[PDB]
Amino acid sequence: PQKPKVSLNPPWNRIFKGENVTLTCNGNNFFEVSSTKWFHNGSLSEETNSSLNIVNAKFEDSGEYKCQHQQVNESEPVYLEVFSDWLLLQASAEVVMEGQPLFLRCHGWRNWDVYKVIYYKDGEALKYWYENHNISITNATVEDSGTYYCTGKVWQLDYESEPLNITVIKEKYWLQFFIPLLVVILFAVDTGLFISTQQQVTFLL
Amino acid sequence: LGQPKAAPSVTLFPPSSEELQANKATLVCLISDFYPGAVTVAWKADSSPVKAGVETTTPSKQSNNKYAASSYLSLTPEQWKSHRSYSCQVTHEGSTVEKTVAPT
Amino acid sequence: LGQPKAAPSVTLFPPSSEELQANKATLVCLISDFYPGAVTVAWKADSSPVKAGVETTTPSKQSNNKYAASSYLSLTPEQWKSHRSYSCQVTHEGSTVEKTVAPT
Amino acid sequence: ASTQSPSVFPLTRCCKNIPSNATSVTLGCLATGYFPEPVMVTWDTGSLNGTTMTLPATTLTLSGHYATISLLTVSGAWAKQMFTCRVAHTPSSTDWVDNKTFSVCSRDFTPPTVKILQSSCDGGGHFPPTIQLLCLVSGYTPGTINITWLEDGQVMDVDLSTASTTQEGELASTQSELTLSQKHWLSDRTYTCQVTYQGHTFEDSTKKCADSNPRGVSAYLSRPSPFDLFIRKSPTITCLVVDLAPSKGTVNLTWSRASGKPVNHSTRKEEKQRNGTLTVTSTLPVGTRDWIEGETYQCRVTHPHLPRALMRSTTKTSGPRAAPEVYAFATPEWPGSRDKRTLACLIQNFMPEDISVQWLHNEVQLPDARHSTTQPRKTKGSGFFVFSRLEVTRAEWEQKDEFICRAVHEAASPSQTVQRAVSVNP
Amino acid sequence: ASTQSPSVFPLTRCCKNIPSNATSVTLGCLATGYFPEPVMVTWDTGSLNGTTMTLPATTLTLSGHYATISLLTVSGAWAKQMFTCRVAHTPSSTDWVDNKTFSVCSRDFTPPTVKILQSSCDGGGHFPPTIQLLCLVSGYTPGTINITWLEDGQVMDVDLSTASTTQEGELASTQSELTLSQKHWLSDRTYTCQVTYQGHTFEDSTKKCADSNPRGVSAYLSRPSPFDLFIRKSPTITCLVVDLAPSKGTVNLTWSRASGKPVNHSTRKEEKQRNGTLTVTSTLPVGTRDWIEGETYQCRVTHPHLPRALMRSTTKTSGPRAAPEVYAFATPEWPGSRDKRTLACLIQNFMPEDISVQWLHNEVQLPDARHSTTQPRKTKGSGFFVFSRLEVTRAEWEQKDEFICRAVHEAASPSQTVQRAVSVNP
Amino acid sequence: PQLCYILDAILFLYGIVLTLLYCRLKIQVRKA
Amino acid sequence: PQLCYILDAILFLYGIVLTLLYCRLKIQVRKA
Amino acid sequence: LTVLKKEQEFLGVTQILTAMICLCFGTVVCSVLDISHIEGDIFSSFKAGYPFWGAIFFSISGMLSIISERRNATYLVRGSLGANTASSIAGGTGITILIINLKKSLAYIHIHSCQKFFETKCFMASFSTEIVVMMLFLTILGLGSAVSLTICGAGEE
């Protein structure tokens, strides 16, 4: 065993009430077919069978979820929320790391059609288009990190989505010193060669 | 049978609008000039007769010697409206004529 | 002068439908009793004259001692259609008369 | 069970059933809802000769009521002669008699067929500068046909429309032509060619053929009109839900308060609109005491599809108080309009927005349609102003030469009302 | 030169040109392309005998062939008289004579007008399952008719269509119908009606109406206010476009006129909004005279995102014209506000909607944003109305004691403006 | 570029010191 | 960084130039 | 004439220093990290260690002339002439190699945006590319200087 990790079939944590989601976890060592174990809200669930399923998500089917293989540890809890809105902001990897991609989506209740979707980052507009479109950053940065929210038009009425919040977390400083170390080596070679050779010249005169 | 048989004359009056507005459905059929004062009154709705809610007065003569009757079919206004058409049949001779009454 | 001066009389006939459909556009203005045979005949389109397609007939006398002439503006139907109107200006005995004829 | 007042309704043989060449017409009156068996039925045929006969009442086992049919037979112009049936019950009362006059044969008019055709858009991709609407009434029984055009439920000037008639044989057909601007048509306003003819009326409506994207439900919360809240002292707020399609499902509307205290019994009304949608109006009679103390009310609207229940709230608005100032103006005589005049009223400098305006003549309030008013707007300084306009005919001021403009407002100290009198001729 | 048969054609003065009461009507026959100078011309006017005259032959400039006009003058019913002209050329042949019959009013041409009317959708904005297109032709001389309907340039069976004809006086009308499925119409496929007349045939094309809002982008076209149209004499019209998604491109906004005449140069401006959207505004100076003659302008927009142009026509308001009536009043003094006053000007009974107002003191107009004016409201009778109010300080009415309420309206007298004087303390 | 700036300044100072030492030793050699 | 690297290369060039200049003195001390 | 050889021992020492610098500018990289793993296409000669000959050539170019500084032999003169010709060729070779390396480094920086995107691998690539470019430039310069110095020996006999 290695460390069991969970994954959501639709990568988004935030879901609408009545929206299905199935989350399953595996350390890539499903060799013993030993029925894994699940906890949520620090309770015990009777679904030893892997691939936990949430069908018709209710307001009580949200919470911290953990799984433990037959002997291995339980691993980190992936949270879950369920909302009842018109527009929902769904982000994949809400706590993604800097080098990694990013992705956002403005879901409309019951798959209704949103128009004039504007994405706001930190209270300053970011992109406008005539219909739904997804923001899709391919290599996060330390500057694209802050509360977002989309604005849309459903049934020709203006609606807004409660804000999300993305955050980006950061090289070998030793390598940078080494490159300065190499620069110092070259400079010292030149300076010492010059001064010491001149000193030998003086001692030879 | 002391007098020659008289062909019944049946007139079907469509239900009154004011009476219908009062949640009452009444279909009136007046039978007059019928020497054979022994007939059966039947109220038919759509394609089949409506026996329920139909009452016919006993045949009698009012200074005419002919059996005249007032067959009234009573039913809820919704039931009458559902029926495509109303028919009143008086069975007293071999040439019975059915009077047709409809809301419009 | 051998005879008193006579004011020319000019009558212009716009081309008919048959002439227009005949692949030609000929407008004829006939001038009668125009001095002794000296007169100026001009054909103009709208407000400008035409220097081509215009033929003038020398004055002639037929038992009248006067001068008779015919001015024929000949051109394609498109040229006549383009012009707003056809003006047949006849000057004789010091008097100028302009006749305005249009197909309409 | 108790005595019941008898109800008598006419009933006659159908005109189609009755032979056209058969002058004799048999009709009658059916009397029901009279518990006492005895009954007196009188049939009058007017000038036309008529004979009235009575038959035993037919008991109704379903409800216990007795039904008696009195048959009147007339000869000659029976249909043209009115038949009057009077039914009285002696046990009920000496004067408890109901008399109804009706004709055996009723007038019948073919319902004219109305269609609306539109000026075909320019074949390239667009419309001409002006759009024509042709409202055509097809074959119908000739008569004083009246054609009108409703600018979204409101009749506009007839001159804008042009009406013409045609008579093919004995069959009549009418054509009405109405021209509107391109901007008007593009503004998406429903136009209805309501047709009024002998008997009843018929109508058809049209609007710009827009795409499929319904407008979506919405709600609005009223407020007690000061007239009701101060003169009648019977305030009633209203929750108006509009744009909900007349399908899918109904809407549940709940009346709550800030304190959650018991609420009165609200009254709900559902109405279908010409623009294709349904509307709901719920009136809640609030207590004057609740409003004076600013007790907030609340309308909560739930729909089986809406993610969230729509919320609306109302309460006495807070701000300084200043009584209104009233001025009355009478228009001097204008040439060509000597027989009618116009009066104006200016109400200004009142702090809280809501206000009521009345036009009193002969110490009696006139119909509200007789005048027009402007919604309060913020004056350049502090306050509000409103202009009221009224139109008067000759006889109207001939009866009396003095009108009154009255402003009813909470700020007015004496009785929450200030009146000013104006006479056309000084 | 080469000998050819002369061509003889009739030539008669127009009926309007020929006096109605004139007792003499002159027509004739003109022969052209007759190389041989000799020619025989004979004129006949039925039973009536007229005067026949001939003129010297004139060679055609193009070819030189002799051409001659023979003129016959008749008296009486010359318009209905038949003029027969026989022209022969002896050199051409011994019997090569051509006779042509014509009259002043022998015949003419009657080009009819055609238009297509479709089936207007239900008041809800939903197309009917079946759509009816009826193309009507009017003002055609009686004769053979061959109807046709080209769907995208192709014709389907005639059973889908029905043709009816009628005639009143001399004007003839024809109606050809056609029925299409809603899916077919939604397919956005152009159709056209045609009627074969004299071998040339006519064509009127119609197709599905465009959106008028390609992808939610909206355009608004303004109008020139009467104050500009007459007082400043510098009218302009503005085209605004909103909700554009920024890109590496530009909107090809242009202009035009109904007649295609030249248009002055126009400005342009693009602005970025906090919404991440882009607005574009353009302005075009206009001719006040042209505006009075109703030359309809039109703003046309284009973009890479939008799939179709976004055009918006504009013009002058139609309908009957009526001058406005203007009154002005001064609000009496009220305690506690002695140092200020209010002046109210009422304007009414002007059929056109557009009207501008201004307040003039010391013969110099007061600032635009110092007075409040409503929007026109239809009166119970005819003509709109508008109120306007201003506040005057003590000094303005103290140093000078006269105010002017001026209203600028299209039909307002030759000056197009009506003014009234107000004295605070007369 | 705090580290880079410090390295650059140190390199410049070291170069100046080396040049001064070269001048000193050159004086020692040529002068004798 | 990249500008810093180019500056490092220029510094190496300057050091090489200084070494070339001092080559004459070194040879004179050792050889001449 | 005699000026070109003014320096024969000085030229020898300078050539030795130039060759040592040219080699060392990339020897540390070759002894530190796998240059072949260097991404960004700036590893044209980092992993190969081509200067393994280049700088050496420069040294060799000087070496054949160095003997003429003290020994003063015609055979040393011919060796110096050959070494100088080889250094002249190697100068162009190294100049072209360094130009290619600089172009590759510029392309890699532009693609990865090393001005602001200084990732760990980006820093390693920058250091390695600098090492390789310095080695190539020093090797080319050593070839040129060795040829210039040995011109004196070439003219000696």
Swiss-Prot record, chain A:
It is found in: Cell membrane. Its main location: membrane. Disulfide bonds join C25-C67, C106-C150. The chain crosses the membrane at residues 177-195. Glycans are attached at N20, N41, N49, N73, N134, N139, N165. GO terms for molecular function: high-affinity IgE receptor activity; IgE binding. Keywords: Cell membrane, Disulfide bond, Glycoprotein, IgE-binding protein, Immunoglobulin domain, Membrane, Receptor, Repeat, Signal, Transmembrane, Transmembrane helix. It comes from the Eukaryota. The keyword Metal-binding does not apply. Residues 1-176 are extracellular. This is High affinity immunoglobulin epsilon receptor subunit alpha. It comes from Homo sapiens (Human). The lineage of its organism: Eukaryota, Metazoa, Chordata, Craniata, Vertebrata. The chain holds residues 27 to 234 of 257 of the full protein.
Swiss-Prot record, chains F, G:
GO terms for cellular component: cell surface; external side of plasma membrane; Fc-epsilon receptor I complex; Fc-gamma receptor III complex; ficolin-1-rich granule membrane; plasma membrane; tertiary granule membrane. One of its GO terms (biological process) is innate immune response. It is found in: Cell membrane. Keywords: Cell membrane, Disulfide bond, IgE-binding protein, Immunity, Innate immunity, Membrane, Phosphoprotein, Receptor, Signal, Transmembrane, Transmembrane helix. GO terms for molecular function: identical protein binding; IgE binding; IgE receptor activity; IgG binding; protein homodimerization activity. The chain crosses the membrane at residues 3-23. It comes from the Eukaryota. IgE Fc receptor is a tetramer of an alpha chain, a beta chain, and two disulfide-linked gamma chains. Associates with FCGR1A; forms a functional signaling complex. The signaling subunit of immunoglobulin gamma (IgG) Fc receptor complex. As a homodimer or a heterodimer of CD247 and FCER1G, associates with the ligand binding subunit FCGR3A to form a functional receptor complex. Associated with CLEC6A. Interacts with CLEC4E. Interacts (via ITAM domain) with SYK (via SH2 domains); activates SYK, enabling integrin-mediated activation of neutrophils and macrophages. Adapter protein containing an immunoreceptor tyrosine-based activation motif (ITAM) that transduces activation signals from various immunoreceptors. As a component of the high-affinity immunoglobulin E (IgE) receptor, mediates allergic inflammatory signaling in mast cells. As a constitutive component of interleukin-3 receptor complex, selectively mediates interleukin 4/IL4 production by basophils, priming T-cells toward effector T-helper 2 subset. Associates with pattern recognition receptors CLEC4D and CLEC4E to form a functional signaling complex in myeloid cells. It comes from Homo sapiens (Human).
Swiss-Prot record, chain H:
GO terms for biological process: cell surface receptor signaling pathway; immune response. Belongs to the MS4A family. One of its GO terms (cellular component) is external side of plasma membrane. This is High affinity immunoglobulin epsilon receptor subunit beta. It is found in: Membrane. Residues 30-47, 101-130 are extracellular. It comes from Homo sapiens. Phosphorylated on tyrosine residues by LYN. The chain holds residues 51 to 207 of 244 of the full protein. The lineage of its organism: Eukaryota, Metazoa, Chordata, Craniata, Vertebrata.
